């Protein structure tokens, strides 16, 4: 009974997708298939710095008058960038649907990058990075990406190295903007109280101008020993299958089974036919090795012996979590934008439920043995990590005798 | 060959099983071979 996500396509290739619902406020966003994976180490912070510059004024709406408009209807304006996708989204009321779309049009095209602003946003970005190091789990996941995807564009961070940040100019940005903002790589996603025909007419009216035009898992480890920190963060991952491979669903159930360290989180990060599947835990130094041992046993267990009931637990757990319908509009659309960018279609919740209920214990331990057993992991540690075991002990813990 | 790894090495027990079988046969070959090599080496100087 969940309403279907209807997708149309303009000549530009900008797929305009929408999923109407009763809620009177909507989350209209633009997703773009452009991240740090498409950068070539000479423009490693171009997407991040453009994400900073995108709300500082356009040609038609110069400066803060633009954001005055998004204050005037009381709407909320957000943007984010990952290694593969960039999103500019607005939460607003339903009746303010046209102007919001027009605002989004300016943000993707006709944007203006002021040289004055460029220096101010450089100091913002530089400073944030200079303090970003504070967030350990971000440092550990960046280290894990770097040591797992050495020599590839997937190792480099979204923010880029301070070097590039300082060394960036309007023209470079202009390039990234004019290169990675093509209309066939763009989805206009709407969730909530929107009509699809009105949204399609608004996309035809504005946004109809947008121009129309592998990775290797290096199993290895990076350890940043700094003994003055109170807690240690350790992430261990193996290679993931990718977006389009259905056993992801089964792997998600495996994560739902795992769900000794103060904090233990499992992740299945997916990129275009690659990814990182693993666990991140933050612990006191004198516990670290025991955690690792614990964690490896669980994984090995699933690969070795997994019952029927726990599987059911994961199935159900995932089900409720996977549930996103009417979770929130922002989430809803976020899902429409990512589904049109990655799968090329919006997978409905009934298909997700079918793929969940076809998962049993035998295929779960088969897929877990395919992806976890006797695999070389990527290890990233930060903090008092002397008792964190080196690569032979972790690699030997990746199988059982 | 992946087959070897997939079939003989993947399962630790098989890894042992193959080693076990190999050991059972290695002796035969090595013994006989070395014996003959030795025999040839000292082809004429022996009890015979």
């Amino acid at each position: 009974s969940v309403p279907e996500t209807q997708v149309s396509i303009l000549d530009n290739g900008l797929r305009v997708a929408s999923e109407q619902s009763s809620h009177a406020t909507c989350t209209v966003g633009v997703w773009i298939d452009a991240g740090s994976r498409y950068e070539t180490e000479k423009n490693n912070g171009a997407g991040y710095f453009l994400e900073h510059l995108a709300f500082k004024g356009t040609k038609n709406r110069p400066g803060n008058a633009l954001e005055k408009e998004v204050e005037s209807i009381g709407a909320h304006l957000n943007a984010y960038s990952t290694r593969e996708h960039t999103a500019y989204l607005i939460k607003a009321l339903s009746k303010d649907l046209p102007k919001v779309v027009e605002l989004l049009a300016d943000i993707v095209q006709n944007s203006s990058l002021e040289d004055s602003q460029i220096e101010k946003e450089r100091d913002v970005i530089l400073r944030e990075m200079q303090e970003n190091d504070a967030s350990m789990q971000n440092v550990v996941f960046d280290y894990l990406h770097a040591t797992a995807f050495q020599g590839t564009p997937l190792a480099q961070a979204v923010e880029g190295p301070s070097e590039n940040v300082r060394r960036l100019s309007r023209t470079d940005l202009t390039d990234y903007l004019n290169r990675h903002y093509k209309a066939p790589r763009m989805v206009l996603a709407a969730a909530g109280g929107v009509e699809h025909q009105q949204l399609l007419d608004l996309a035809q009216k504005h946004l109809s101008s947008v121009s129309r035009v592998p990775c290797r898992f290096t199993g290895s480890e990076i350890r940043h020993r700094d003994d003055a920190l109170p807690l240690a963060h350790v992430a261990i991952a193996v290679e993931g299958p990718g977006w389009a491979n259905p056993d992801n669903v089964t792997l998600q159930v495996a994560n739902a089974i795992i769900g000794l360290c103060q904090s233990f989180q499992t992740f299945n990060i997916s990129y275009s036919d690659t990814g990182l599947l693993g666990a991140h835990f933050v612990c006191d130094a004198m516990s670290i090795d025991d955690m690792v041992f614990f964690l490896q046993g669980q994984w090995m267990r699933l690969c070795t012996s997994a019952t029927e009931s726990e599987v059911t637990r994961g199935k159900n757990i995932l089900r409720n979590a996977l549930v996103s319908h009417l979770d929130g509009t922002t989430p809803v659309c976020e899902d429409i934008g990512r589904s049109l960018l990655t799968y090329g279609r919006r997978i409905p919740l009934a298909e997700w439920e079918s793929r969940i209920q076809e998962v049993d214990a035998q295929m779960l331990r088969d897929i877990c043995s395919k992806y976890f057993y006797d695999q070389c992991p990527a290890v990233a540690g930060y903090g008092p990590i002397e008792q964190l075991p080196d690569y032979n002990r972790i690699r030997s813990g990746m199988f059982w005798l | 060959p992946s087959r070897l790894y997939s079939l003989l090495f993947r399962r630790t027990s098989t890894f042992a099983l193959t080693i076990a079988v190999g050991a059972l046969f290695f002796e035969r070959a090595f013994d006989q071979g070395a014996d003959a090599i030795y025999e040839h080496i000292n082809e004429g100087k022996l009890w015979k």
């Binding site: 050495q150 880029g160 | 992946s2 997939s6």
Partner: peptide
């Protein structure tokens, strides 16, 4: 910060990838 540098080039050491995973 962390982003300042990239994993040093181990290519010299790196050998000449699941297709090769079992092989290796």
């Amino acid at each position: 910060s962390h982003t300042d540098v990239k994993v040093p080039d181990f290519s010299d050491y790196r050998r000449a990838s699941k297709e090769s995973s079992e092989a290796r």
